Amino acid sequence: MVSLPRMVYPQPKVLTPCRKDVLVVTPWLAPIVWEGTFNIDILNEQFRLQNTTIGLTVFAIKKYVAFLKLFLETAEKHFMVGHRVHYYVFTDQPAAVPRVTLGTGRQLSVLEVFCERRFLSEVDYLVCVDVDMEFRDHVGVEILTPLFGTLHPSFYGSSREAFTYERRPQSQAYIPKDEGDFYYMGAFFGGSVQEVQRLTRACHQAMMVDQANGIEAVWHCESHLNKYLLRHKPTKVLSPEYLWDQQLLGWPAVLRKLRFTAVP
């Protein structure tokens, strides 16, 4: 880890919190990433000195190929600008992937529907998102950490009893009513390649056990993600700035930026 250069920025003040309206750290001491909690210049310096490469993975199957153009074009505008990016587009229609113009240090691979050794050699972090989305504001290195989840936009204010966890004890994704930190959305999670592979290997195994026992979790991948993240605490949590639906939920005051959003 190389030394940071001289930098001039406003002093952080110990007796003036940036955000008083929201929880900015979890009880396991992981940052909850909200606008106003980070200086992106410091963070960009730290990650550029490491020459960080971010992999962004999306699945675009059947009619979802129609979402790739806006997704990638807006990712070009807002996602990890200044850093190395490798897009991994998983699709059943290689020829329907749009030819999107990419900035320097950025590349796209189309994988037709195996990648574990490849990810380890090519990227430092993996970000796993849904394709029926667009970037509308900065999504940068502030999110990067060994393991992260994102607060589901419908449940960030809800008590744990109301979370739509799998509640049947016969599923591997089972979480009782007296357990749970947050409801994480399956549409945005990530971390180091090693942690994301651990997570997905655990999730896949848990899903196969359910399948053998003739049971399917209420919210599928997201139910298993929530169980993993309960038992393996994420090292950062992203606020609902990072996964929003403005048609469904508007623009409440607690959100200073809408960064990544659902497309109608």
Side-chain angles (χ1 to χ4, degrees), residues 1-17 19-61 63-113 115-116 118-210 212-246 248-264:
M1 188 77 253
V2 187
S3 164
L4 295 166
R6 157 178 171 86
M7 293 176 75
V8 176
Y9 48 80
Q11 187 190 340
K13 286 201 89 151
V14 179
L15 305 175
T16 304
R19 298 293 296 260
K20 303 182 184 73
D21 53 335
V22 290
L23 185 65
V24 298
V25 66
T26 70
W28 56 93
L29 293 172
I32 307 175
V33 184
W34 301 89
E35 180 63 17
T37 62
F38 61 91
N39 181 319
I40 195 56
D41 302 319
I42 295 160
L43 295 170
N44 280 332
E45 279 291 346
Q46 288 177 321
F47 288 87
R48 274 308 297 152
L49 291 162
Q50 295 277 109
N51 192 25
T52 300
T53 307
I54 309 95
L56 179 56
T57 308
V58 279
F59 280 74
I61 302 295
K63 296 290 173 70
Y64 286 89
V65 295
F67 294 100
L68 284 163
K69 186 183 151 70
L70 186 63
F71 177 87
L72 297 168
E73 274 172 6
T74 59
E76 282 300 299
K77 202 146 284 158
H78 296 300
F79 182 80
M80 305 288 171
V81 175
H83 306 272
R84 302 176 99 252
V85 176
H86 201 143
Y87 301 100
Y88 298 98
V89 177
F90 290 90
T91 182
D92 59 351
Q93 302 152 83
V97 173
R99 171 176 55 87
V100 172
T101 308
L102 306 188
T104 190
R106 302 172 78 96
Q107 58 177 305
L108 189 140
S109 300
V110 182
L111 295 310
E112 203 178 344
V113 305
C115 286
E116 170 159 39
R118 190 172 161 178
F119 288 145
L120 286 166
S121 67
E122 293 187 341
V123 306
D124 302 303
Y125 297 91
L126 265 175
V127 184
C128 307
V129 298
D130 288 349
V131 73
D132 52 330
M133 299 290 295
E134 58 175 321
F135 294 88
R136 287 179 47 183
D137 217 325
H138 173 100
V139 178
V141 297
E142 74 283 355
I143 76 169
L144 302 175
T145 191
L147 182 63
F148 73 85
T150 306
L151 295 185
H152 193 292
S154 303
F155 299 97
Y156 70 94
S158 308
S159 62
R160 56 153 66 109
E161 317 200 304
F163 293 167
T164 54
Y165 293 148
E166 177 52 64
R167 306 306 194 164
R168 292 168 289 166
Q170 301 79 30
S171 170
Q172 294 310 272
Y174 171 54
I175 302 169
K177 252 76 159 69
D178 61 0
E179 281 184 68
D181 304 304
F182 305 114
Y183 197 77
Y184 305 102
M185 177 138 83
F188 198 160
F189 65 93
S192 66
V193 174
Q194 181 177 241
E195 289 296 328
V196 173
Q197 284 157 358
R198 280 172 188 157
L199 179 146
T200 59
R201 193 153 54 242
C203 278
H204 181 52
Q205 155 53 198
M207 285 166 213
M208 288 169 85
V209 177
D210 275 15
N213 297 337
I215 188 153
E216 180 63 22
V218 63
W219 288 110
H220 315 286
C221 288
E222 177 173 282
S223 299
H224 293 91
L225 179 66
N226 270 279
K227 184 60 172 291
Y228 189 86
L229 290 180
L230 178 60
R231 306 300 227 238
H232 307 80
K233 303 297 193 204
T235 45
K236 293 182 177 165
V237 180
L238 309 182
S239 73
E241 300 170 359
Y242 291 87
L243 265 177
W244 200 249
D245 187 341
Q246 196 185 359
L248 257 204
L249 303 164
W251 193 334
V254 77
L255 304 179
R256 298 186 181 180
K257 300 195 167 196
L258 308 184
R259 303 167 188 281
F260 187 53
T261 64
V263 183

PDB file of all heavy atoms in Angstrom, residues 58-91, unseen atoms left out:
ATOM      1  N   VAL A  58     -23.627  -9.081 -15.204  1.00  0.00           N
ATOM      2  CA  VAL A  58     -25.071  -9.042 -15.482  1.00  0.00           C
ATOM      3  C   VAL A  58     -25.483 -10.242 -16.332  1.00  0.00           C
ATOM      4  O   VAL A  58     -24.720 -10.706 -17.188  1.00  0.00           O
ATOM      5  CB  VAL A  58     -25.523  -7.760 -16.239  1.00  0.00           C
ATOM      6  CG1 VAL A  58     -25.684  -6.590 -15.291  1.00  0.00           C
ATOM      7  CG2 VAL A  58     -24.571  -7.400 -17.371  1.00  0.00           C
ATOM      8  N   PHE A  59     -26.706 -10.707 -16.093  1.00  0.00           N
ATOM      9  CA  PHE A  59     -27.358 -11.730 -16.895  1.00  0.00           C
ATOM     10  C   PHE A  59     -28.437 -11.055 -17.731  1.00  0.00           C
ATOM     11  O   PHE A  59     -29.278 -10.328 -17.200  1.00  0.00           O
ATOM     12  CB  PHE A  59     -27.957 -12.825 -16.000  1.00  0.00           C
ATOM     13  CG  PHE A  59     -26.940 -13.832 -15.531  1.00  0.00           C
ATOM     14  CD1 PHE A  59     -26.024 -13.500 -14.540  1.00  0.00           C
ATOM     15  CD2 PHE A  59     -26.875 -15.096 -16.103  1.00  0.00           C
ATOM     16  CE1 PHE A  59     -25.069 -14.414 -14.121  1.00  0.00           C
ATOM     17  CE2 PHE A  59     -25.919 -16.013 -15.694  1.00  0.00           C
ATOM     18  CZ  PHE A  59     -25.017 -15.675 -14.699  1.00  0.00           C
ATOM     19  N   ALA A  60     -28.391 -11.285 -19.039  1.00  0.00           N
ATOM     20  CA  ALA A  60     -29.383 -10.755 -19.966  1.00  0.00           C
ATOM     21  C   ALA A  60     -29.909 -11.902 -20.850  1.00  0.00           C
ATOM     22  O   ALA A  60     -29.348 -12.204 -21.910  1.00  0.00           O
ATOM     23  CB  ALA A  60     -28.776  -9.635 -20.796  1.00  0.00           C
ATOM     24  N   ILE A  61     -30.981 -12.532 -20.376  1.00  0.00           N
ATOM     25  CA  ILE A  61     -31.576 -13.729 -20.983  1.00  0.00           C
ATOM     26  C   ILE A  61     -32.944 -13.379 -21.561  1.00  0.00           C
ATOM     27  O   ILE A  61     -33.690 -12.591 -20.972  1.00  0.00           O
ATOM     28  CB  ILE A  61     -31.745 -14.851 -19.927  1.00  0.00           C
ATOM     29  CG1 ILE A  61     -30.393 -15.208 -19.283  1.00  0.00           C
ATOM     30  CG2 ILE A  61     -32.395 -16.106 -20.522  1.00  0.00           C
ATOM     31  CD1 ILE A  61     -29.369 -15.809 -20.228  1.00  0.00           C
ATOM     32  N   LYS A  62     -33.268 -13.985 -22.702  1.00  0.00           N
ATOM     33  CA  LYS A  62     -34.545 -13.779 -23.402  1.00  0.00           C
ATOM     34  C   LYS A  62     -34.816 -12.283 -23.669  1.00  0.00           C
ATOM     35  O   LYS A  62     -33.974 -11.611 -24.267  1.00  0.00           O
ATOM     36  CB  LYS A  62     -35.693 -14.473 -22.651  1.00  0.00           C
ATOM     37  N   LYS A  63     -35.955 -11.759 -23.210  1.00  0.00           N
ATOM     38  CA  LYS A  63     -36.325 -10.364 -23.463  1.00  0.00           C
ATOM     39  C   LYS A  63     -35.507  -9.337 -22.667  1.00  0.00           C
ATOM     40  O   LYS A  63     -35.583  -8.146 -22.965  1.00  0.00           O
ATOM     41  CB  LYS A  63     -37.824 -10.154 -23.209  1.00  0.00           C
ATOM     42  CG  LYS A  63     -38.739 -10.943 -24.150  1.00  0.00           C
ATOM     43  CD  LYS A  63     -38.713 -10.406 -25.579  1.00  0.00           C
ATOM     44  CE  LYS A  63     -39.479 -11.291 -26.553  1.00  0.00           C
ATOM     45  NZ  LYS A  63     -40.952 -11.238 -26.337  1.00  0.00           N
ATOM     46  N   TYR A  64     -34.740  -9.792 -21.665  1.00  0.00           N
ATOM     47  CA  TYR A  64     -33.868  -8.908 -20.899  1.00  0.00           C
ATOM     48  C   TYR A  64     -32.686  -8.335 -21.677  1.00  0.00           C
ATOM     49  O   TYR A  64     -32.107  -7.336 -21.235  1.00  0.00           O
ATOM     50  CB  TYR A  64     -33.395  -9.565 -19.595  1.00  0.00           C
ATOM     51  CG  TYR A  64     -34.494  -9.627 -18.565  1.00  0.00           C
ATOM     52  CD1 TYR A  64     -35.366 -10.718 -18.506  1.00  0.00           C
ATOM     53  CD2 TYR A  64     -34.695  -8.574 -17.673  1.00  0.00           C
ATOM     54  CE1 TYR A  64     -36.392 -10.761 -17.571  1.00  0.00           C
ATOM     55  CE2 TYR A  64     -35.716  -8.605 -16.734  1.00  0.00           C
ATOM     56  CZ  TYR A  64     -36.559  -9.697 -16.682  1.00  0.00           C
ATOM     57  OH  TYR A  64     -37.574  -9.730 -15.755  1.00  0.00           O
ATOM     58  N   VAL A  65     -32.340  -8.919 -22.829  1.00  0.00           N
ATOM     59  CA  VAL A  65     -31.311  -8.318 -23.699  1.00  0.00           C
ATOM     60  C   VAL A  65     -31.658  -6.890 -24.116  1.00  0.00           C
ATOM     61  O   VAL A  65     -30.758  -6.096 -24.393  1.00  0.00           O
ATOM     62  CB  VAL A  65     -30.981  -9.149 -24.970  1.00  0.00           C
ATOM     63  CG1 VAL A  65     -30.360 -10.482 -24.591  1.00  0.00           C
ATOM     64  CG2 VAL A  65     -32.193  -9.314 -25.888  1.00  0.00           C
ATOM     65  N   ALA A  66     -32.954  -6.574 -24.137  1.00  0.00           N
ATOM     66  CA  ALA A  66     -33.425  -5.228 -24.433  1.00  0.00           C
ATOM     67  C   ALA A  66     -32.976  -4.163 -23.410  1.00  0.00           C
ATOM     68  O   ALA A  66     -33.024  -2.974 -23.711  1.00  0.00           O
ATOM     69  CB  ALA A  66     -34.946  -5.217 -24.582  1.00  0.00           C
ATOM     70  N   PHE A  67     -32.560  -4.579 -22.214  1.00  0.00           N
ATOM     71  CA  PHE A  67     -32.112  -3.641 -21.192  1.00  0.00           C
ATOM     72  C   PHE A  67     -30.612  -3.315 -21.255  1.00  0.00           C
ATOM     73  O   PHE A  67     -30.176  -2.396 -20.578  1.00  0.00           O
ATOM     74  CB  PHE A  67     -32.479  -4.172 -19.804  1.00  0.00           C
ATOM     75  CG  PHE A  67     -33.959  -4.235 -19.550  1.00  0.00           C
ATOM     76  CD1 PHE A  67     -34.649  -5.437 -19.655  1.00  0.00           C
ATOM     77  CD2 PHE A  67     -34.670  -3.089 -19.208  1.00  0.00           C
ATOM     78  CE1 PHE A  67     -36.019  -5.502 -19.421  1.00  0.00           C
ATOM     79  CE2 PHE A  67     -36.040  -3.143 -18.971  1.00  0.00           C
ATOM     80  CZ  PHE A  67     -36.716  -4.352 -19.079  1.00  0.00           C
ATOM     81  N   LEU A  68     -29.831  -4.048 -22.058  1.00  0.00           N
ATOM     82  CA  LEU A  68     -28.365  -3.907 -22.034  1.00  0.00           C
ATOM     83  C   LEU A  68     -27.867  -2.534 -22.465  1.00  0.00           C
ATOM     84  O   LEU A  68     -26.918  -2.014 -21.876  1.00  0.00           O
ATOM     85  CB  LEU A  68     -27.669  -4.989 -22.885  1.00  0.00           C
ATOM     86  CG  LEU A  68     -27.600  -6.404 -22.292  1.00  0.00           C
ATOM     87  CD1 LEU A  68     -27.275  -7.414 -23.373  1.00  0.00           C
ATOM     88  CD2 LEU A  68     -26.587  -6.509 -21.150  1.00  0.00           C
ATOM     89  N   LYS A  69     -28.503  -1.937 -23.475  1.00  0.00           N
ATOM     90  CA  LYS A  69     -27.985  -0.683 -24.041  1.00  0.00           C
ATOM     91  C   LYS A  69     -27.999   0.439 -23.004  1.00  0.00           C
ATOM     92  O   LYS A  69     -26.965   1.025 -22.726  1.00  0.00           O
ATOM     93  CB  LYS A  69     -28.758  -0.272 -25.302  1.00  0.00           C
ATOM     94  CG  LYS A  69     -28.184   0.951 -26.018  1.00  0.00           C
ATOM     95  CD  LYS A  69     -29.039   1.366 -27.218  1.00  0.00           C
ATOM     96  CE  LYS A  69     -28.961   2.868 -27.494  1.00  0.00           C
ATOM     97  NZ  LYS A  69     -27.628   3.264 -28.005  1.00  0.00           N
ATOM     98  N   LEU A  70     -29.163   0.723 -22.425  1.00  0.00           N
ATOM     99  CA  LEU A  70     -29.256   1.744 -21.380  1.00  0.00           C
ATOM    100  C   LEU A  70     -28.380   1.396 -20.168  1.00  0.00           C
ATOM    101  O   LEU A  70     -27.729   2.282 -19.596  1.00  0.00           O
ATOM    102  CB  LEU A  70     -30.706   1.959 -20.937  1.00  0.00           C
ATOM    103  CG  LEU A  70     -30.974   3.108 -19.954  1.00  0.00           C
ATOM    104  CD1 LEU A  70     -30.616   4.457 -20.565  1.00  0.00           C
ATOM    105  CD2 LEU A  70     -32.424   3.099 -19.504  1.00  0.00           C
ATOM    106  N   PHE A  71     -28.360   0.119 -19.785  1.00  0.00           N
ATOM    107  CA  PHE A  71     -27.551  -0.327 -18.643  1.00  0.00           C
ATOM    108  C   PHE A  71     -26.073   0.014 -18.837  1.00  0.00           C
ATOM    109  O   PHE A  71     -25.457   0.682 -17.995  1.00  0.00           O
ATOM    110  CB  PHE A  71     -27.714  -1.835 -18.398  1.00  0.00           C
ATOM    111  CG  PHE A  71     -26.855  -2.351 -17.271  1.00  0.00           C
ATOM    112  CD1 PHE A  71     -27.313  -2.314 -15.960  1.00  0.00           C
ATOM    113  CD2 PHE A  71     -25.569  -2.835 -17.517  1.00  0.00           C
ATOM    114  CE1 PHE A  71     -26.511  -2.758 -14.916  1.00  0.00           C
ATOM    115  CE2 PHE A  71     -24.768  -3.280 -16.477  1.00  0.00           C
ATOM    116  CZ  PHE A  71     -25.239  -3.240 -15.174  1.00  0.00           C
ATOM    117  N   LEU A  72     -25.515  -0.431 -19.956  1.00  0.00           N
ATOM    118  CA  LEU A  72     -24.093  -0.236 -20.238  1.00  0.00           C
ATOM    119  C   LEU A  72     -23.756   1.233 -20.500  1.00  0.00           C
ATOM    120  O   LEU A  72     -22.748   1.725 -19.998  1.00  0.00           O
ATOM    121  CB  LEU A  72     -23.646  -1.112 -21.418  1.00  0.00           C
ATOM    122  CG  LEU A  72     -23.765  -2.619 -21.169  1.00  0.00           C
ATOM    123  CD1 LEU A  72     -23.592  -3.369 -22.477  1.00  0.00           C
ATOM    124  CD2 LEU A  72     -22.757  -3.103 -20.141  1.00  0.00           C
ATOM    125  N   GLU A  73     -24.601   1.924 -21.263  1.00  0.00           N
ATOM    126  CA  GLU A  73     -24.378   3.348 -21.548  1.00  0.00           C
ATOM    127  C   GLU A  73     -24.341   4.208 -20.288  1.00  0.00           C
ATOM    128  O   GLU A  73     -23.508   5.103 -20.181  1.00  0.00           O
ATOM    129  CB  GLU A  73     -25.435   3.899 -22.506  1.00  0.00           C
ATOM    130  CG  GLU A  73     -25.078   3.668 -23.960  1.00  0.00           C
ATOM    131  CD  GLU A  73     -26.197   4.040 -24.910  1.00  0.00           C
ATOM    132  OE1 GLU A  73     -27.228   4.591 -24.451  1.00  0.00           O
ATOM    133  OE2 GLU A  73     -26.032   3.761 -26.119  1.00  0.00           O
ATOM    134  N   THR A  74     -25.255   3.936 -19.356  1.00  0.00           N
ATOM    135  CA  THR A  74     -25.289   4.655 -18.085  1.00  0.00           C
ATOM    136  C   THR A  74     -24.184   4.211 -17.151  1.00  0.00           C
ATOM    137  O   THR A  74     -23.634   5.050 -16.444  1.00  0.00           O
ATOM    138  CB  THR A  74     -26.639   4.543 -17.363  1.00  0.00           C
ATOM    139  OG1 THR A  74     -26.950   3.172 -17.093  1.00  0.00           O
ATOM    140  CG2 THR A  74     -27.744   5.206 -18.193  1.00  0.00           C
ATOM    141  N   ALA A  75     -23.849   2.910 -17.153  1.00  0.00           N
ATOM    142  CA  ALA A  75     -22.648   2.432 -16.462  1.00  0.00           C
ATOM    143  C   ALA A  75     -21.393   3.177 -16.941  1.00  0.00           C
ATOM    144  O   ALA A  75     -20.557   3.568 -16.127  1.00  0.00           O
ATOM    145  CB  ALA A  75     -22.472   0.929 -16.628  1.00  0.00           C
ATOM    146  N   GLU A  76     -21.269   3.396 -18.249  1.00  0.00           N
ATOM    147  CA  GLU A  76     -20.147   4.195 -18.767  1.00  0.00           C
ATOM    148  C   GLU A  76     -20.065   5.598 -18.154  1.00  0.00           C
ATOM    149  O   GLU A  76     -18.982   6.097 -17.876  1.00  0.00           O
ATOM    150  CB  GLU A  76     -20.182   4.260 -20.309  1.00  0.00           C
ATOM    151  CG  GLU A  76     -19.662   2.984 -20.970  1.00  0.00           C
ATOM    152  CD  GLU A  76     -18.223   2.706 -20.570  1.00  0.00           C
ATOM    153  OE1 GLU A  76     -17.350   3.548 -20.866  1.00  0.00           O
ATOM    154  OE2 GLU A  76     -17.963   1.678 -19.920  1.00  0.00           O
ATOM    155  N   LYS A  77     -21.220   6.203 -17.911  1.00  0.00           N
ATOM    156  CA  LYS A  77     -21.308   7.550 -17.357  1.00  0.00           C
ATOM    157  C   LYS A  77     -21.031   7.604 -15.842  1.00  0.00           C
ATOM    158  O   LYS A  77     -20.483   8.591 -15.341  1.00  0.00           O
ATOM    159  CB  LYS A  77     -22.710   8.097 -17.646  1.00  0.00           C
ATOM    160  CG  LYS A  77     -22.860   9.609 -17.620  1.00  0.00           C
ATOM    161  CD  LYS A  77     -23.894  10.063 -18.660  1.00  0.00           C
ATOM    162  CE  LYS A  77     -23.338  10.031 -20.088  1.00  0.00           C
ATOM    163  NZ  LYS A  77     -24.411   9.957 -21.124  1.00  0.00           N
ATOM    164  N   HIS A  78     -21.415   6.554 -15.116  1.00  0.00           N
ATOM    165  CA  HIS A  78     -21.528   6.636 -13.646  1.00  0.00           C
ATOM    166  C   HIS A  78     -20.771   5.587 -12.816  1.00  0.00           C
ATOM    167  O   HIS A  78     -20.532   5.816 -11.618  1.00  0.00           O
ATOM    168  CB  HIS A  78     -23.005   6.591 -13.278  1.00  0.00           C
ATOM    169  CG  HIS A  78     -23.787   7.769 -13.779  1.00  0.00           C
ATOM    170  ND1 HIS A  78     -23.497   9.068 -13.413  1.00  0.00           N
ATOM    171  CD2 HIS A  78     -24.838   7.844 -14.631  1.00  0.00           C
ATOM    172  CE1 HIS A  78     -24.338   9.891 -14.017  1.00  0.00           C
ATOM    173  NE2 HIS A  78     -25.173   9.171 -14.749  1.00  0.00           N
ATOM    174  N   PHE A  79     -20.379   4.464 -13.424  1.00  0.00           N
ATOM    175  CA  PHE A  79     -19.846   3.336 -12.668  1.00  0.00           C
ATOM    176  C   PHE A  79     -18.324   3.280 -12.744  1.00  0.00           C
ATOM    177  O   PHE A  79     -17.739   3.012 -13.811  1.00  0.00           O
ATOM    178  CB  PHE A  79     -20.482   2.024 -13.143  1.00  0.00           C
ATOM    179  CG  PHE A  79     -20.024   0.809 -12.385  1.00  0.00           C
ATOM    180  CD1 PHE A  79     -20.566   0.496 -11.149  1.00  0.00           C
ATOM    181  CD2 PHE A  79     -19.060  -0.036 -12.923  1.00  0.00           C
ATOM    182  CE1 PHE A  79     -20.142  -0.631 -10.462  1.00  0.00           C
ATOM    183  CE2 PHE A  79     -18.631  -1.159 -12.240  1.00  0.00           C
ATOM    184  CZ  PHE A  79     -19.181  -1.460 -11.009  1.00  0.00           C
ATOM    185  N   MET A  80     -17.695   3.540 -11.604  1.00  0.00           N
ATOM    186  CA  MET A  80     -16.252   3.364 -11.423  1.00  0.00           C
ATOM    187  C   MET A  80     -15.425   4.151 -12.440  1.00  0.00           C
ATOM    188  O   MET A  80     -14.354   3.693 -12.857  1.00  0.00           O
ATOM    189  CB  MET A  80     -15.869   1.874 -11.479  1.00  0.00           C
ATOM    190  CG  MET A  80     -16.620   0.979 -10.511  1.00  0.00           C
ATOM    191  SD  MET A  80     -16.095   1.226  -8.813  1.00  0.00           S
ATOM    192  CE  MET A  80     -17.311   0.255  -7.931  1.00  0.00           C
ATOM    193  N   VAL A  81     -15.906   5.344 -12.805  1.00  0.00           N
ATOM    194  CA  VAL A  81     -15.245   6.159 -13.829  1.00  0.00           C
ATOM    195  C   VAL A  81     -13.872   6.545 -13.294  1.00  0.00           C
ATOM    196  O   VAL A  81     -13.757   7.019 -12.163  1.00  0.00           O
ATOM    197  CB  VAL A  81     -16.077   7.409 -14.211  1.00  0.00           C
ATOM    198  CG1 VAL A  81     -15.328   8.305 -15.188  1.00  0.00           C
ATOM    199  CG2 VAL A  81     -17.404   6.990 -14.824  1.00  0.00           C
ATOM    200  N   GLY A  82     -12.839   6.292 -14.091  1.00  0.00           N
ATOM    201  CA  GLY A  82     -11.448   6.522 -13.692  1.00  0.00           C
ATOM    202  C   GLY A  82     -10.695   5.249 -13.338  1.00  0.00           C
ATOM    203  O   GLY A  82      -9.464   5.243 -13.351  1.00  0.00           O
ATOM    204  N   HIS A  83     -11.429   4.176 -13.031  1.00  0.00           N
ATOM    205  CA  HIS A  83     -10.845   2.880 -12.679  1.00  0.00           C
ATOM    206  C   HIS A  83     -11.032   1.860 -13.795  1.00  0.00           C
ATOM    207  O   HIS A  83     -11.859   2.058 -14.686  1.00  0.00           O
ATOM    208  CB  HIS A  83     -11.481   2.382 -11.382  1.00  0.00           C
ATOM    209  CG  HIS A  83     -11.379   3.371 -10.268  1.00  0.00           C
ATOM    210  ND1 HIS A  83     -10.296   3.420  -9.413  1.00  0.00           N
ATOM    211  CD2 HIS A  83     -12.191   4.397  -9.912  1.00  0.00           C
ATOM    212  CE1 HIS A  83     -10.464   4.412  -8.555  1.00  0.00           C
ATOM    213  NE2 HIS A  83     -11.603   5.021  -8.836  1.00  0.00           N
ATOM    214  N   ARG A  84     -10.263   0.771 -13.735  1.00  0.00           N
ATOM    215  CA  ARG A  84     -10.398  -0.329 -14.708  1.00  0.00           C
ATOM    216  C   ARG A  84     -11.695  -1.098 -14.435  1.00  0.00           C
ATOM    217  O   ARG A  84     -11.963  -1.480 -13.295  1.00  0.00           O
ATOM    218  CB  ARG A  84      -9.206  -1.297 -14.665  1.00  0.00           C
ATOM    219  CG  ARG A  84      -7.859  -0.653 -14.933  1.00  0.00           C
ATOM    220  CD  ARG A  84      -6.686  -1.617 -14.793  1.00  0.00           C
ATOM    221  NE  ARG A  84      -6.228  -2.130 -16.093  1.00  0.00           N
ATOM    222  CZ  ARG A  84      -6.395  -3.367 -16.569  1.00  0.00           C
ATOM    223  NH1 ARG A  84      -7.023  -4.321 -15.874  1.00  0.00           N
ATOM    224  NH2 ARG A  84      -5.918  -3.658 -17.778  1.00  0.00           N
ATOM    225  N   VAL A  85     -12.491  -1.297 -15.486  1.00  0.00           N
ATOM    226  CA  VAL A  85     -13.748  -2.019 -15.407  1.00  0.00           C
ATOM    227  C   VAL A  85     -13.757  -3.131 -16.466  1.00  0.00           C
ATOM    228  O   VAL A  85     -13.355  -2.914 -17.618  1.00  0.00           O
ATOM    229  CB  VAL A  85     -14.968  -1.083 -15.586  1.00  0.00           C
ATOM    230  CG1 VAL A  85     -16.276  -1.876 -15.611  1.00  0.00           C
ATOM    231  CG2 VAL A  85     -15.016  -0.042 -14.466  1.00  0.00           C
ATOM    232  N   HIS A  86     -14.212  -4.314 -16.057  1.00  0.00           N
ATOM    233  CA  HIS A  86     -14.461  -5.423 -16.969  1.00  0.00           C
ATOM    234  C   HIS A  86     -15.918  -5.822 -16.803  1.00  0.00           C
ATOM    235  O   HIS A  86     -16.310  -6.274 -15.735  1.00  0.00           O
ATOM    236  CB  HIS A  86     -13.522  -6.590 -16.646  1.00  0.00           C
ATOM    237  CG  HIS A  86     -13.336  -7.554 -17.779  1.00  0.00           C
ATOM    238  ND1 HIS A  86     -12.127  -8.163 -18.042  1.00  0.00           N
ATOM    239  CD2 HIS A  86     -14.198  -8.004 -18.720  1.00  0.00           C
ATOM    240  CE1 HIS A  86     -12.255  -8.956 -19.090  1.00  0.00           C
ATOM    241  NE2 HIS A  86     -13.503  -8.879 -19.521  1.00  0.00           N
ATOM    242  N   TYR A  87     -16.728  -5.596 -17.837  1.00  0.00           N
ATOM    243  CA  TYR A  87     -18.121  -6.034 -17.851  1.00  0.00           C
ATOM    244  C   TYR A  87     -18.163  -7.500 -18.287  1.00  0.00           C
ATOM    245  O   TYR A  87     -17.477  -7.892 -19.241  1.00  0.00           O
ATOM    246  CB  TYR A  87     -18.963  -5.224 -18.841  1.00  0.00           C
ATOM    247  CG  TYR A  87     -19.041  -3.719 -18.634  1.00  0.00           C
ATOM    248  CD1 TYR A  87     -18.249  -2.852 -19.389  1.00  0.00           C
ATOM    249  CD2 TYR A  87     -19.938  -3.161 -17.721  1.00  0.00           C
ATOM    250  CE1 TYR A  87     -18.334  -1.476 -19.232  1.00  0.00           C
ATOM    251  CE2 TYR A  87     -20.023  -1.781 -17.549  1.00  0.00           C
ATOM    252  CZ  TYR A  87     -19.221  -0.940 -18.304  1.00  0.00           C
ATOM    253  OH  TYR A  87     -19.317   0.424 -18.147  1.00  0.00           O
ATOM    254  N   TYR A  88     -18.966  -8.299 -17.596  1.00  0.00           N
ATOM    255  CA  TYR A  88     -19.217  -9.683 -17.971  1.00  0.00           C
ATOM    256  C   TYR A  88     -20.718  -9.809 -18.208  1.00  0.00           C
ATOM    257  O   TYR A  88     -21.516  -9.752 -17.268  1.00  0.00           O
ATOM    258  CB  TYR A  88     -18.740 -10.641 -16.883  1.00  0.00           C
ATOM    259  CG  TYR A  88     -17.235 -10.573 -16.609  1.00  0.00           C
ATOM    260  CD1 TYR A  88     -16.728  -9.813 -15.551  1.00  0.00           C
ATOM    261  CD2 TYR A  88     -16.320 -11.284 -17.396  1.00  0.00           C
ATOM    262  CE1 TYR A  88     -15.357  -9.756 -15.285  1.00  0.00           C
ATOM    263  CE2 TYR A  88     -14.952 -11.228 -17.146  1.00  0.00           C
ATOM    264  CZ  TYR A  88     -14.474 -10.459 -16.091  1.00  0.00           C
ATOM    265  OH  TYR A  88     -13.120 -10.399 -15.832  1.00  0.00           O
ATOM    266  N   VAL A  89     -21.094  -9.916 -19.473  1.00  0.00           N
ATOM    267  CA  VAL A  89     -22.479 -10.049 -19.872  1.00  0.00           C
ATOM    268  C   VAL A  89     -22.750 -11.532 -20.176  1.00  0.00           C
ATOM    269  O   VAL A  89     -22.247 -12.072 -21.168  1.00  0.00           O
ATOM    270  CB  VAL A  89     -22.776  -9.176 -21.118  1.00  0.00           C
ATOM    271  CG1 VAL A  89     -24.214  -9.364 -21.604  1.00  0.00           C
ATOM    272  CG2 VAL A  89     -22.495  -7.702 -20.818  1.00  0.00           C
ATOM    273  N   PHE A  90     -23.540 -12.170 -19.315  1.00  0.00           N
ATOM    274  CA  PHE A  90     -24.030 -13.530 -19.547  1.00  0.00           C
ATOM    275  C   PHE A  90     -25.349 -13.492 -20.311  1.00  0.00           C
ATOM    276  O   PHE A  90     -26.300 -12.846 -19.877  1.00  0.00           O
ATOM    277  CB  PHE A  90     -24.161 -14.283 -18.222  1.00  0.00           C
ATOM    278  CG  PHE A  90     -22.834 -14.608 -17.595  1.00  0.00           C
ATOM    279  CD1 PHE A  90     -22.230 -13.731 -16.706  1.00  0.00           C
ATOM    280  CD2 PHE A  90     -22.168 -15.786 -17.927  1.00  0.00           C
ATOM    281  CE1 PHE A  90     -20.994 -14.032 -16.136  1.00  0.00           C
ATOM    282  CE2 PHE A  90     -20.932 -16.094 -17.366  1.00  0.00           C
ATOM    283  CZ  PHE A  90     -20.343 -15.213 -16.471  1.00  0.00           C
ATOM    284  N   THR A  91     -25.395 -14.163 -21.460  1.00  0.00           N
ATOM    285  CA  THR A  91     -26.568 -14.102 -22.334  1.00  0.00           C
ATOM    286  C   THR A  91     -26.751 -15.359 -23.192  1.00  0.00           C
ATOM    287  O   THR A  91     -25.792 -16.078 -23.466  1.00  0.00           O
ATOM    288  CB  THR A  91     -26.521 -12.848 -23.231  1.00  0.00           C
ATOM    289  OG1 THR A  91     -27.705 -12.786 -24.050  1.00  0.00           O
ATOM    290  CG2 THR A  91     -25.264 -12.825 -24.108  1.00  0.00           C
TER     291      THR A  91
END
